[PDB]
Design a protein around this ligand. Sequence first.
Ligand SMILES: *Cc1cc2c(cc1C)nc1c(=O)[nH]c(=O)nc-1n2C[C@H](O)[C@H](O)[C@H](O)COP(=O)(O)OP(=O)(O)OC[C@H]1O[C@@H](n2cnc3c(N)ncnc32)[C@H](O)[C@@H]1O
Ligand SMILES: *Cc1cc2c(cc1C)nc1c(=O)[nH]c(=O)nc-1n2C[C@H](O)[C@H](O)[C@H](O)COP(=O)(O)OP(=O)(O)OC[C@H]1O[C@@H](n2cnc3c(N)ncnc32)[C@H](O)[C@@H]1O
Ligand SMILES: C/C=C/c1ccc(O)c(OC)c1
Ligand SMILES: C/C=C/c1ccc(O)c(OC)c1
Lengths: 523, 525
Amino acid sequence: TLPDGVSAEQFANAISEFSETIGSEYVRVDEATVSEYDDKFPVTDGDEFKGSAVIWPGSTEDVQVIVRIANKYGIPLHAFSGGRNLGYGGSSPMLTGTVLLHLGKRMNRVLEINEKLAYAVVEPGVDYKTLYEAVRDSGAKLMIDPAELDWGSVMGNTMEHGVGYTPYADHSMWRCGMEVVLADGEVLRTGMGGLPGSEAWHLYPGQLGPSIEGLFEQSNFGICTRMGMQLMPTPPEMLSFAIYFENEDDLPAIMETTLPLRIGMAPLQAAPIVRNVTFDAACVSKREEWQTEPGPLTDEAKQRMVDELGIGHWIVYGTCYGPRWQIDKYIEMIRDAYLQIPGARFETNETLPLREGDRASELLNARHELNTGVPNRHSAAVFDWFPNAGHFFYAPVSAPSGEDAAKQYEDTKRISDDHGIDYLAQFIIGLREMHHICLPLYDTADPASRKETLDMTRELIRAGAEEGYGIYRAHNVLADQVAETYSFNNHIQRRSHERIKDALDPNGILNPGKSGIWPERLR
Amino acid sequence: FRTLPDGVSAEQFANAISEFSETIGSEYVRVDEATVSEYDDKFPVTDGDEFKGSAVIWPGSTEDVQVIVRIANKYGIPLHAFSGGRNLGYGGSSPMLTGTVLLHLGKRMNRVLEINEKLAYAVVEPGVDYKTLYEAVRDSGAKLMIDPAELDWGSVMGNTMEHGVGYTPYADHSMWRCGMEVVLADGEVLRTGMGGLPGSEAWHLYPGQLGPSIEGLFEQSNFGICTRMGMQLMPTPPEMLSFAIYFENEDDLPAIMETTLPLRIGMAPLQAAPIVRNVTFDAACVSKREEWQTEPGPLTDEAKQRMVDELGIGHWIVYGTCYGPRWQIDKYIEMIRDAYLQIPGARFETNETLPLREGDRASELLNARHELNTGVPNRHSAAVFDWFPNAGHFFYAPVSAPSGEDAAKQYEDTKRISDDHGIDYLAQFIIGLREMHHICLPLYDTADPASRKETLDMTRELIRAGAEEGYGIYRAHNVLADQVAETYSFNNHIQRRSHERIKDALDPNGILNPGKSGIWPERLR
Ligand SMILES: *Cc1cc2c(cc1C)nc1c(=O)[nH]c(=O)nc-1n2C[C@H](O)[C@H](O)[C@H](O)COP(=O)(O)OP(=O)(O)OC[C@H]1O[C@@H](n2cnc3c(N)ncnc32)[C@H](O)[C@@H]1O
Ligand SMILES: *Cc1cc2c(cc1C)nc1c(=O)[nH]c(=O)nc-1n2C[C@H](O)[C@H](O)[C@H](O)COP(=O)(O)OP(=O)(O)OC[C@H]1O[C@@H](n2cnc3c(N)ncnc32)[C@H](O)[C@@H]1O
Ligand SMILES: C/C=C/c1ccc(O)c(OC)c1
Ligand SMILES: C/C=C/c1ccc(O)c(OC)c1
C-alpha cells in the first residue's frame, strides 16, 4: 500500500534514507512484519487503515532523524509506544500508506524509580507488567495504576487519556514531565525539564506561562520518547468488595447511591465500577455455556448467568485503602448504603477469597488485583466468549444520574439487540462525571459482524449526541463522526485543534486526521 | 491621551476609541487620567511610563468582549484583559506594554451564574471574588466550601488563570477549574471540553472531550479572554480542626521539611499542604516594623527574637488543617503532633487549645489560617501593607524538590541577598505533595524610587541564584517576564518558541497583552 499523493520512487527514497540513518534491520517493508501492525479488531474490510512500513527506533536521536526524513519527503507518520490500543484501532494509522513508528520494541527501559518522591520515569515500551516488576524488585513501597490488560504501555495509555482503578486512576493527572520530539524533529522538555539542572521535571506540572503536556493527548502534535509517572505510596492495608444486585432495574438506584459516597473522595476512595452480568460472565465462561442460538442474548440466558455464577444483574466493585480503622469505618458505610436496595448482597475478598472452581471469587480477585496495583490479563478471557471475539468501544461521558444511566443502558441494549451484538456494560463515577463503556463483542473474522458493529456504533453516536452525551475516546473509523458532534459555534473546537496542529506540524506529517484534527494540506 | 501604544499615532488611537464608544457606549470607555491612573501597578518597581495603560473599557457581556477584540484587530491596538485586576506582587492591573488598552471584565461581568450542590460546583463571571462567592454559597444553604487565596478581593476566575493556589485540599485552583467560555483573539467564542457538545450537562463535570484539552493554554498566557468559568467546590466535611506548630531555632527548617514530606506525599495525615512561615511574616499580619526596630536597615537578630518572645510564637510556624469525622481528625492530629514534637523546643496548639481571644495575637494569627483552611475568606494578611508606610511586595516564587537541604539553602541565600539590598524578607514554604514552593515576599517602600531600584536589583539577584541551583519560578511580575522565560533555556528556548507558535496561530495580529510570560507576537520579535 502507499500514502495518497506519494509516488513509489518518492516513497523508496525516504525508505532508503530511513535505512541509512537507523539501519535496514530496523526499517521493515516485508508484508509479514507490517501485517502485525494492522488493526487486530478491524470493523472495515478493505485497504482502510493499513501501514506501508514500520520502524523500530532505539533512541530520541533516531526519532528526530525519522521525523526529519518524513518532513523532507512529506510521508505521513504514526508513532505509538505499545501498539495495543484494542477497541480504538490498536496500532493502525488514520491514513493508508502511513509509516508506523513502534517505539516500544527497543526503547523500553524503566529509567528511574524514586522512592522518597514516589514517581518513576519510563520509555514507551515499559508496560504495566514490567513497571510492576521493576518497582517490586526496587523494594520501593509504591504501587502502579494499571488498566485491565497488563500489556498496555504506561506512556501510551496515558496519551489516550486512559484510566485504571486505584485512587491514581486518572493517568493523565499523574504523568509529569515528558520528553517530546516535535513535528519538525526538535526535542522539547515539558515543565521544569525546560530548566537546566532542575530536579522538579517529574515533581511539578508547571513552568512560566502555559502547560502544553495536555496538548499531547489524543492528538498528532509530537512523539513522546520519555515520560514521568507519579505513583501512589502503598498504604498499610487494602480491602476489596463486590456488591450483587438482583434486578436490571437496580441500575438507577446504584448510581444515585454512589454519587454522594464518591464526590467527597470518601468512603469511596477510588472510582467503583458497575458492570452488568454479561461483562462478568464473559471473563470466566464462554457464550455457548449459557445460550446456543446465535441471536441476541435472551432474558432467560442472562438470568442463568446470575443464578449459576452466584452474582447479580449488576455488580459493583471497589476497594478501601489505609489502616484498618479507616477501612472498617469506610467498609461499614459502603455496606450500609448499598444494602438499602432490596436483594443487594455484599462480599469482601476475605468473605469471598480466591477458591478453586469458585468463579465469583476469581473475578473478585481480578478486581482486587487491579485495584491494589497488581496487573493481570484476566479481562483477555472475554476474547474467548466466542471464536474471534473482539471489541469496538462506545464510551460516552455524562453526569452521574440514576435515569441518566438507565436511558444509556435501556437505549444501548435496544440498538445492540437490533444488530444482534452482545452488550457488555461498565459504568464508572469518577467524582462528578459518569463514564459509560459499551463493550460490544463481535466476530472480527466475519465481515457481516464488522458492518453490523459499525452501523450499530454509528447509531449509538447519533443517539448519544441527541441526548447530550459526548464520546471522550474513539476508534480511527469514528474520529470524524465524533469530532462532528462537538458542534458548538461551527466546530470552533476542531478548528482550534487545527490551528494548533498547523502551528506545531506545518507540513501535516503526524497521523493526519487523529481525533478529527486534519492538517491544512488535507482540507 | 496619557500614553500611546508604540507604532499607533494619536489620531489612529482616537479613531479606535470612537469605535469602542460607538459599539459599547462612551460611559464604558475611559481615557481620563483620574480613571485610568486607578489601574496603574499599585506596587510599581519602575519610575516612568513603563506598564501604563492608555485607557480602560468596562464590557458588560461576552458579546461586548467580542466586539472590542474585533475593533482592536482592525485598529492594531494591544489589549490586556483581567477579571478583578488586583494581581498585587505580579503587576496588579498593569500590562506588559505602555499604551495598552485594559479590559476590566469584573466591574460589570460579576454574577455568580449557578451553585450546584448535587454535583458540587459553581459557575462564575470574572467579577466574582472569594468573599462574594462565599456569601452566595452560604445564602444557597449548599454544604459546599470555596478555596480562597489570602485576600478575599481576589477574583475566583482571575486567580485560577495566574495558576494561583489556596490552602484547603482544593488548593490547586487550575485543577478544579472545569468548563471555560473564552473569547479568542479574533473575537470568536470557544466553549472548552464538553461545552462543545450541544445539550451536554458535563461542561463543568469532566475536563475532557475528544482530542487535546486546551483549558491549560489560557494559564499565564495571552491567547484568550475568559468570560465564564466553572469551579468545582469541595463538599463540606463533618468537622475541621486547624493547628499551629512553633519551632524555636530558625535552624529547625531542615528538620521541619524532612518531617513534613512523609506526612504529606500520601495525602494523609496532612490532607492539605501545610505552610512554613518565618517569624517576620507572622509579625507583619498583627504588628508594625517600628514596634521591634526603629533603625531602618536589615532586621537584626534581636528584632526577630523580640517578635518570637512577645507574640509567643516560633522562628518558624507550621499551619495546617485536618478534615473529616471526629474519629479521623483525632487520629491524624496525633500523628502530626507526635511527628513534629520530636523536634526539640517545638510546641503544638489547635484552634480549640488556642482559641481567638482579644489581644492574643498568636490566637489571631491561627484564627486567620483556620479561616482560610476551612474556606472562610478574610483580609487578615492585608495587614502586611501597614508593616511601614507604603509597604508593598514583589514576589520571588521558585519551585524545587521538597528537601530540607534545599529549604535551608533557599532561606540562607534569599536572606543574605535581601540583607545586601536592605529589603525585609517574609518567607513562606508550602509543600505540595511531591514539590515545594518557596514564596519570597519582600516588603519595600512603593513610594520611594531608591527602594524600587533596590527591590528590582534584589529580585534579578534571586532569579540568577535560583536558576544557578536549578530552582524555576512558575509566576513572575510583568517586569521579570523576559529574565524568567530565559531561565527555561533547554534547546535554545524551545519552550518560549513553542509558546510563540501557538501565540501566532491563535493571535495572528498579536493583539492580546504582548510579552506576557516572554510570549511575544511575531510582529515584535
Ligand atoms: C479490549 C479491551 C481494551 C481495554 C480494556 C479492556 C478490554 C477488554 N480496558 C481498558 C481500561 O481499563 N483502561 C484503558 O485505558 N484502556 C482499556 N482498554 C483499551 C486498551 O487496551 C488500552 O488503552 C491500552 O493500554 C492501549 O494500548 P497501548 O497502551 O499499547 O497504547 P498505544 O497503542 O501504544 O498508544 C495509543 C495512541 O496514543 C498515542 N501515542 C502513544 N504513544 C505515543 C508516543 N510515544 N508519542 C506520541 N503519541 C503516542 C498514539 O495516538 C497511539 O496510537
Ligand atoms: C500581596 C499579596 C498577594 C498575594 C498573596 C498575599 C499577599 C500579601 N497571597 C496569595 C495567595 O495565597 N495565593 C495566590 O494565588 N496569590 C496570592 N497573592 C497574589 C494576588 O493577591 C492574588 O493571586 C490575586 O487573586 C490575583 O488578582 P486577581 O484575582 O484580581 O486576578 P486578575 O488581576 O483579575 O488576573 C490576573 C491575570 O490573569 C489573567 N486573567 C485574569 N482574568 C482573565 C480573564 N477573564 N481573561 C483572560 N486572562 C485573564 C491576566 O493575565 C491577568 O493579568
Ligand atoms: C472494561 C473497560 C474498558 C475500557 C476501555 C476504555 C476506557 O477508557 C476505559 O476506562 C476505564 C475502560
Ligand atoms: C503569603 C502567600 C503569597 C503567595 C503569592 C503567590 C502565590 O501563588 C502563593 O501561593 C500560596 C502565595
